[PDB]
Design a protein around this ligand. Structure first.
Ligand code: MG
Ligand code: MG
Lengths: 202, 202
């Protein structure tokens, strides 16, 4: 078994963050999705490997809460938005994930996220809308970085967790799914790597 | 401050497990709830403290999947079931938790569970149905022991996580919430305590 396959019983951690048009996954638009795969180096340390990132054209009939959209800072009609259909974006991300599962001897991906059940619900709902087959993510379990940061740093807020971890993080409020996914992947790998450094995985 | 108040940013971990009439928190019955508060000893180690347990009468209009009843072994009409209205059970549990909060110098409870978002979703749906305003739990944050066990033991399945931890876990024929709560509490405390043993919280 590949070293990464042994670490989480055959699941490959893939960090995902979404931006949405509200908090209801059944009805609310998906507006951005980033996904960052994790690799394992020759010494058994995790690192963020590849990032996918797409801005998403709201699905037909989606609900968008005006205040929610306003707080994200997203500009739907901006000429450089480069928004794509959710099916196209998921197809490309999934393809990349399946390639990574094969390279790591893993059977399935597990979503890693900050308050990760939120992202997983939106991901499951988009998959259900598009009718995409062979979703490589576990449908129900996820690694919550708010839980990991609670343990490691006694913090549940993402910015405060990253600050505690010695990382840079901006209290600007205007961050794309890409920024959040890369910071979350760094937080995730740092905690797992500290656990190893402290004797937790020999 | 109180040392527990400093560990998780004023939140008191409280383990919750529910048994339910299916996987949909909007429609499916709450049938049992167990909650176990955690305390901190003089040496800074967490331990499982006070337990509450109630069998719940299905709310009027609730959906109960035949397969949920087979899985749990639940007999709704058994004369010694001693099931109570969800509003009464929650009120009693919440009162008990508030007492734990005060004794730990904490301001809110944070739900701990195995795939904790599941249990938080059912708790919030019951709180909504009953109109309880005095809910001491955080509405969206939780500590997921599937995440914690993935870190510590590479295991996401509760039974297997406990076995990796050196605990006994009975490969039972009827699933119980009192049993999962007791074991989840041990699992949670064991991992937080291991972090500390390894030099992670000084
Ligand atoms: Mg997010
Ligand atoms: Mg459970």
């Amino acid at each position: 078994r590949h070293p990464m396959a042994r670490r989480f019983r055959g699941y490959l951690p893939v960090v995902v963050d979404v931006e949405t048009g509200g908090f209801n996954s059944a009805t609310d638009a998906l507006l951005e999705i980033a996904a960052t795969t994790v690799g394992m180096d020759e010494k058994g340390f995790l690192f963020p490997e590849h990032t996918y990132f797409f801005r998403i054209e709201p699905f037909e009939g989606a609900n968008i809460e005006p205040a929610a959209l306003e707080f994200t800072g997203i500009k739907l009609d901006h000429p450089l938005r480069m928004a794509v259909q959710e099916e196209a974006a998921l197809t490309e991300i999934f393809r990349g994930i399946r390639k990574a599962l094969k390279a790591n001897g893993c059977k399935r991906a597990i979503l890693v996220g900050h308050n990760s059940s939120f992202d997983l619900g939106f991901l499951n709902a988009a998959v259900a809308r598009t009718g995409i087959k062979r979703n490589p993510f576990h449908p129900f379990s996820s690694f919550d970085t708010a839980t990991l940061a609670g343990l490691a740093y006694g913090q549940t807020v993402l910015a405060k967790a990253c600050q505690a971890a010695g990382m840079e993080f901006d209290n600007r409020e205007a961050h794309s799914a890409r920024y959040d996914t890369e910071k979350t992947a760094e937080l995730f790998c740092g905690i797992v790597n500290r656990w190893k450094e402290m004797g937790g995985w020999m």
